[PDB]
């Protein structure tokens, strides 16, 4: 009896209708000449990789795969879906049926068929597939990543790997906007050199291959001139630059005004409108223009429930067709409640786009952000139609957070951040999943103790036992049971991190090796901290003085380490223990 494996995103409607069956070593492929070229290629790579030959002629004793779009006239597909249809679903939707030795995929459109194949790829383990009836479609139409952080831009190989990863998780958007690319911002007028344009072409091609909308961003707010000949010339520089990327296949554009000194709301919006009319609309096959205003968090946008000067004028002027992004109540903030999206959607009289600054860490580079989407309201889709996360300069470990963003944006009302977090690590880390959870569990909360705060609290279940222990001691209760529980947790912290150091692939390890060393140190310091409590209860001062020096030794190492992790849990416990009782 074959079970449904981990899926991501969580499909909207899935029922098991059979025991499952084993896919034969050679399959009948049906509808591939009419079906979406990218879907079929994804399917061929998968088949090749899992050693499944495709029959040159029909063989009745071999599994049959039928694939196609609603708008292909292919009846063998309607027959095999067995009353299930993709006809009535929203764009990017699909239907999938596996039953009685046949697998049928029907996409509402091609994007849909590609996503149907991704789910097919996820359902097969070792040639076995469950027998299921699926109809599936996204909550949010635009889902993906804005590469818009400060610091070391992603490499070419980072981005190509990222793009393949988006397609596998049905993320359909990637915005190119690295702050430290000189041609994106510092020197936005200058054309890309020939060799960089060759790298660009590769990224564009891979994007199309994986159904990702590659958005080319530009940030001219540093030094753009708006008026007379200078404003003409500067405007034509935007046109020239977008044209040269259009001519390579780019069909999405963004013009950003964030983090600049000039706050000319009217001029910003007029540039957008002019570009929207002379470029986006003229071309006719270019997707809606994206922007971010110079005021882009509720705090900077709104005062006493009423829009600020910049925002009011910008909202008044910007054409309704342009997507406008905002980061929520602060630049980096715990939550975006429904009421915040309602307010801002109200000022703009339109559905908004989110620029979510998590897991970005450019504001506190010592910590990894390894937690799930957290504090984003599950009804946000009432006011939000475009969702993007800003990742870290660490592309590999950003995958954990993005994985959960794929689930939240595709099936948002079903989204369980703990379940989604667990699934991300299970799917991405495999044999090492259990141990990686132990480590990652301590690295979900970002707090620069100033204005940036976001993410699930660090290992809450452990913080609760620690808190509980200080009560049992100040309350004179028998704590001996809790101390053994806690010794166990600290040993496992050490065990897990040593295992990761030994066994993680370079691609993950090269990104977090320093933080593993830090958590091992703190685990050792928490253990000595308990030894201190034990010795204090035994009025055994020799053991106390010895444990205390070790505790100070481990703490001294962490405070001087670049690495930051478990500030308020593993670290604080040692600081707590060094404060009498």
């Amino acid at each position: 009896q074959v079970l449904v494996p981990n899926l991501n995103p969580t499909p909207e409607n899935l029922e098991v209708v059979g025991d499952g069956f084993k896919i034969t070593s050679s399959i009948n492929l049906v509808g591939e000449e009419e079906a979406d070229e990218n879907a079929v290629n994804a399917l061929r790579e998968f088949l090749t990789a899992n050693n499944i030959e495709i029959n040159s002629e029909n063989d009745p004793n071999s599994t049959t795969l039928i694939i196609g779009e609603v708008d292909d006239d292919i009846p063998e597909l309607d027959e095999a879906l067995n009353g299930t249809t993709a006809e009535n679903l929203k764009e990017e939707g699909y239907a999938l049926v596996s039953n009685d030795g046949k697998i049928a995929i029907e996409g509402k459109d091609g994007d849909g068929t590609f996503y149907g194949v991704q789910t097919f790829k996820q359902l097969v383990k070792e040639s076995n597939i469950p027998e299921v009836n699926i109809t599936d479609y996204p909550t949010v139409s635009a889902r993906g990543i804005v590469e818009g952080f400060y610091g070391t831009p992603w490499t070419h190989q980072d981005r190509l790997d990222q793009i393949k990863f988006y397609g596998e998780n049905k993320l359909n958007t990637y915005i190119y906007a690295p702050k430290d690319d000189p041609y994106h911002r510092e020197k936005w007028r200058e054309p890309y050199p020939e060799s960089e344009m060759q790298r660009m072409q590769e990224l564009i091609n891979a994007s199309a291959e994986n159904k990702v909308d590659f958005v080319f961003g530009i940030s001219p707010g540093i030094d753009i001139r708006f008026d007379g000949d200078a404003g003409e010339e500067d405007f034509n520089h935007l046109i020239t630059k977008a044209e040269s990327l259009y001519d390579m296949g780019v069909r999405s554009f963004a013009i950003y005004w964030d983090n600049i000194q000039d706050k000319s709301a009217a001029k910003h919006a007029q540039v957008l409108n002019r570009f929207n009319e002379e470029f986006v609309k003229a071309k006719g096959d270019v997707k809606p223009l994206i922007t971010v205003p110079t005021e882009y968090d509720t705090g900077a946008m709104v005062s006493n429930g009423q829009p600020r000067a910049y925002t009011r004028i910008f909202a008044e002027t910007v054409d309704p067709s342009i997507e406008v992004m905002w980061t929520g109540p602060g630049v980096v903030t715990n939550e975006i409640p429904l009421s915040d999206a309602q307010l801002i959607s109200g000022i703009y009289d339109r559905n908004m786009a989110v620029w979510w600054n998590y897991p970005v860490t450019d504001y506190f580079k010592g910590k990894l952000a390894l937690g799930p989407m957290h504090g984003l309201d599950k009804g946000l889709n009432q006011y939000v139609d475009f969702f993007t996360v800003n990742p870290m300069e660490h592309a590999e470990l950003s995958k954990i957070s993005i994985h959960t963003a794929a689930d939240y944006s595709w099936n948002m009302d079903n989204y369980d951040y703990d379940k989604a977090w667990n699934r991300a690590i299970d799917m991405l880390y495999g044999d090492l999943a259990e141990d990686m959870k132990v480590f990652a569990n301590h690295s979900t909360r970002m707090d620069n103790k100033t204005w940036a705060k976001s993410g699930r609290e660090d290992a809450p279940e452990l913080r609760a036992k620690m808190d509980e222990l200080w009560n049992k001691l100040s309350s004179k209760e028998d704590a001996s049971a809790l101390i053994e529980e806690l010794y166990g947790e600290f040993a496992r912290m050490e065990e897990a991190c040593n295992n990761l150091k030994a066994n993680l692939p370079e691609v993950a390890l090269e990104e977090c090796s320093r933080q593993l060393d830090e958590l091992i140190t703190l685990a050792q310091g928490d253990k000595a901290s308990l030894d201190m409590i034990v010795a204090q209860l035994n009025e055994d001062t020799e053991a106390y003085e010895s444990a205390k020096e070790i505790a100070q030794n481990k703490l001294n190492t962490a405070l001087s380490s670049f690495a930051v992790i478990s500030e308020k849990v593993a670290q604080s416990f040692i600081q707590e223990a060094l404060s009498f009782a």
């Binding site: 964030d258 980096v332 504001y363 940036a452």
Partner: peptide, 4 residues
């Protein structure tokens, strides 16, 4: 070096 970052926002805010």
């Amino acid at each position: 070096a970052h926002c805010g």
